[PDB]
């Protein structure tokens, strides 16, 4: 067996490239998983020289989007090198899904059911799933749009579960209010939405004509590296997570950051007064900047609560920290990861929060328990991003294995798997409808996914480097994208969703040029955050790095 793997793979490589061009582009999908599963089985059975020869002969006929995985594999030559990788260990035990059409599968099975190639047929039916759809064979630039992950292009039986992608309060896609036990709406929280709809009165309709104004909030000195930004829902606070293990809150309105008075000062005043909150504020402590200490590592996540208290921060030391914004101290340290927590976010109702880390899970916490409630443990690499749905019944977790996964908060089940990115996903955002999801990664592609159909609905390919920030407008009219090419691109998020299967795919339009409303370049400044004011004004924050 092992000395003739360069005869099995080169025989199937000769069959596919000699096929007709309609089936050739679809049968080129099983070049990459058959190259890795034959290479990893050689190095697991301690056949290093043969493994090295196979890698040298076939690595360069692999698709260009796979270079990073190919480099990790070139390093892997021993068995014990792979026994502690835990990403190729989970790749060897899982099954590549490999969605192919029935018109091309008949040519494949008429070349594998014969005894002439019963060995490569034995590897296919051991290591590869094949998910068959009845339809046209896809084009090469459509197959290129939806592949790219390891154990990628998942089954349609995963993307057929019922997802309550509607907003709460009739919408038939909306979940009930008692599905997830969400917290009560207090009179101070009801007072927030009264002044929120005064901002909505001045909210402009953006569209492709009235392009929004962008106010860049640059961090000027920032010689400790800025790693996390968050803005409150009303543009009042801006948090900064830095590499010197600090969180720094800035007030952007002309209203200094005050702490509440100490317990001796609150005991002498009375409650039940109308002023109460005003009475409690301390004016002795009033700055335009509050520095928060306590992480022993670079703060990677930053998340405000919707009631403008309760800053959240996660860092390299494996803890998620809940900072008060009334006392400006730390309250809780959530130690569930032993590994760098790459992101955290509060729920849009403010009770639960999700944190994704290097240990390839995302935990669901509740700010009341020292232990999590849900563990979302299906990714094969680091959970880079963690985003809540606008109804907070679903959590989207992008990751470094080039997949985006929706997770139901009930039962912890993965209800959607979105594959088609070529690099690790570094930004997710939801549409304000709740129907759509924009994801960005290191390939500079912004892929727009449907959530009810579990189908990608568009691909935005204007950016060059890693797209690290996405946000839709408050109306949903414009998706704003910020990346490391120091550009803030605006995309038409209405013309991108004009059409709303069983083939499990739609013919993507190649329409990025018509969906770009504008590109604005920053002065040597990577756009770390993008925020939309409730009057539809774009805010962006990024450390100025002269580089």
Binding residues (CB under 8 A) for another protein: these are 67-68, 71, 74, 80, 84-86, 89-90, 93, 180-184, 186-187, 244-246, 260, 262-264, 266-267, 271-272, 276, 293-296, 324, 327, 329-333, 335-336, 338-339, 351, 358-361, 366-378, 380, 409-413
Q: Minimum CB separation from another protein for residue 376, in Å?
A: 7
- Cα angle vertex 530, ends 528, 531, to 5°? 140
- Helix H or strand E segment including 246: strand 246-251
Q: Minimum CB separation from another protein for residue 37, in Å?
A: 17
Q: Of 185, 173, 316, 184, nearest to 243 (Cα)?
A: 316
- Which residue number, 276 or 286, has a Cβ lying nearer to another protein? 276
Dihedral over Cα of 10, 15, 17, 18: its sign: positive
- Which residue number, 137 or 357, has a Cβ lying nearer to another protein? 357
Q: Minimum CB separation from another protein for residue 331, in Å?
A: 6
- Which residue number, 90 or 234, has a Cβ lying nearer to another protein? 90
- Which residue number, 135 or 294, has a Cβ lying nearer to another protein? 294
Dump the DSSP string for 253-282: SSS-EEEEPPHHHHHHS-SS-SSTHHHHEE
Alpha carbon distances (Å) from 349 to 113, 183, 266, 391: 56, 7, 29, 8
- Which residue number, 20 or 375, has a Cβ lying nearer to another protein? 375
Q: Of 103, 100, 120, 98, nearest to 111 (Cα)?
A: 120
Q: Minimum CB separation from another protein for residue 95, in Å?
A: 13
Q: Minimum CB separation from another protein for residue 336, in Å?
A: 5
What lies within 8 Å, CB to CB, of 357 at 6+ separation is 314, 318, 337, 339, 340, 341, 342, 363, 382, 383
Q: Minimum CB separation from another protein for residue 340, in Å?
A: 11
- Which residue number, 207 or 412, has a Cβ lying nearer to another protein? 412
Task: Please name the residue that has the structure tokens 């009739």.
Answer: 170
Q: Of 530, 509, 378, 360, nearest to 440 (Cα)?
A: 530
Q: Minimum CB separation from another protein for residue 378, in Å?
A: 7
Distance, CA of 467 to CA of 528 (rounded, Å): 9
Residue positions counted in the chain: 547
- Which residue number, 412 or 476, has a Cβ lying nearer to another protein? 412
């Amino acid at each position: 067996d092992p000395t003739m793997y360069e005869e099995y793979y080169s025989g199937l490589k000769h069959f596919i490239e000699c096929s007709l061009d309609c089936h050739r582009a679809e049968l080129s999908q099983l070049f990459y998983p058959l190259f890795v599963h034959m290479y990893l089985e050689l190095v697991y059975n301690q056949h290093e020289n043969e493994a090295k020869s196979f890698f040298e002969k076939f690595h360069g006929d692999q698709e260009c989007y796979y270079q990073d995985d190919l480099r990790v594999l070139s390093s892997l030559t021993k068995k014990e090198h792979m026994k502690g990788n835990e990403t190729m260990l989970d790749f060897r035990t899982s099954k590549f899904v490999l969605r192919i059409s029935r018109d091309s599968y008949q040519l494949l099975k008429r070349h594998l059911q014969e005894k002439q190639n019963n060995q490569i047929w034995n590897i296919v039916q051991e290591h590869l799933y094949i998910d068959i759809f009845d339809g046209m064979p896809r084009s090469k630039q459509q197959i290129d749009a939806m592949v790219g992950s390891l154990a990628g292009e998942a089954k349609r039986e995963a993307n057929k579960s019922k997802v309550f992608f509607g907003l709460l309060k009739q919408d038939p896609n909306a979940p009930p209010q008692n599905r997830i036990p969400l917290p009560e709406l207090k009179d101070s929280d009801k007072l927030d939405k009264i002044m929120n709809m005064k901002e909505t009165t001045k909210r402009v309709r953006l569209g492709p004509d009235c392009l929004p104004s962008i106010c860049f909030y640059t961090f000027l000195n920032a010689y400790q590296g800025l790693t996390a930004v968050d803005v409150t829902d009303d543009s009042s606070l801006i948090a900064g997570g830095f590499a010197d293990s600090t969180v720094r809150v800035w007030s952007v309105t002309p209203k200094k950051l005050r702490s509440v008075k100490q317990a001796s000062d609150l005991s002498l005043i009375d409650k039940e007064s109308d002023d109460v909150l005003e009475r409690i504020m301390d004016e002795k402590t009033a700055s335009e900047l509050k520095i928060l200490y306590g992480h022993s590592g670079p703060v990677y996540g930053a998340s405000f609560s919707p009631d403008r208290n309760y800053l959240l921060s996660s860092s390299e030391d494996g803890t998620v920290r809940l900072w008060s914004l009334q006392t400006f101290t730390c309250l809780v340290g959530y130690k569930g990861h032993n590994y760098p927590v790459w992101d955290t976010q509060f729920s849009p109702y403010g009770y639960y929060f999700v944190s994704g880390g290097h240990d390839r899970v995302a935990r669901l916490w509740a700010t009341d328990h020292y232990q999590p409630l849900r563990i979302f443990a299906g990714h094969l690499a680091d959970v880079n991003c963690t985003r809540f749905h606008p109804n907070s019944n679903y959590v989207a977790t992008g990751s470094a294995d080039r997949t985006v996964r929706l997770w139901d908060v009930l039962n912890g089940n993965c209800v959607r798997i979105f594959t088609g990115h070529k690099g690790p996903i570094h930004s997710l955002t939801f549409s304000p409808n709740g129907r759509f999801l924009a994801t960005g990664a290191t390939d500079g592609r912004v892929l727009l996914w449907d959530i009810g159909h579990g189908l990608m609905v568009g691909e935005l390919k204007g950016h060059t480097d890693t797209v690290c920030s996405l946000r839709f407008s408050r109306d949903g009219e414009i998706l704003a994208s910020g990346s490391m090419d120091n550009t803030v691109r605006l995309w038409d998020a209405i013309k991108a969703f004009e059409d709303l299967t069983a083939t499990g795919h739609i013919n993507l339009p190649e329409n990025s040029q018509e969906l770009l409303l504008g590109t604005y370049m920053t002065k040597s400044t990577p756009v770390v955050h993008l925020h939309f004011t409730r009057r539809n004004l774009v805010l962006a924050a990024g450390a100025y790095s002269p580089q």
